[PDB]
Design a protein around this ligand. Sequence first.
Ligand code: 08O
Length: 133
Amino acid sequence: MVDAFLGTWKLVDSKNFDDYMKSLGVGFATRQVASMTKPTTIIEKNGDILTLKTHSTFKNTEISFKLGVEFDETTADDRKVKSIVTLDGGKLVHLQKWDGQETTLVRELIDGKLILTLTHGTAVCTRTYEKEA
Ligand SMILES: CCCCCCCC/C=C\CCCCCCCCCCCC(=O)O
């Protein structure tokens, strides 16, 4: 079910990430660095447990979760959130909740590319990742 998402992925296109970060309250200097960073995202499975790594020089993250089971998460920008990841329409949907706010991180496969759509407030960011061999 999750298997076409698995592997190592490299950022190849980003649209509106500054808008998304600004909506989350990320400061200007951090948004500069982020705007020039191309993370590597690694998605692995071991039974029911998925592990999603995001690697870059200035910041790394890692989460492990079971689909459909809430987990605590501390995001790259240091929000402490309540998270759940599910499959919806073949898309891997990650919902984060904190302080009565929400943001969604939706991953969809289109023509072999992984499209990540990030929504917070009115801001909608689209980032495209391509699979490493
Ligand atoms: C873990 C790498 C995240 C992207 C590079 C961040 C470089 C600047 C370092 C710290 C600031 C964190 C900034 C924005 C974090 C917003 C929430 C996570 C966005 C994930 C985007 C992605 O996976 O492509």
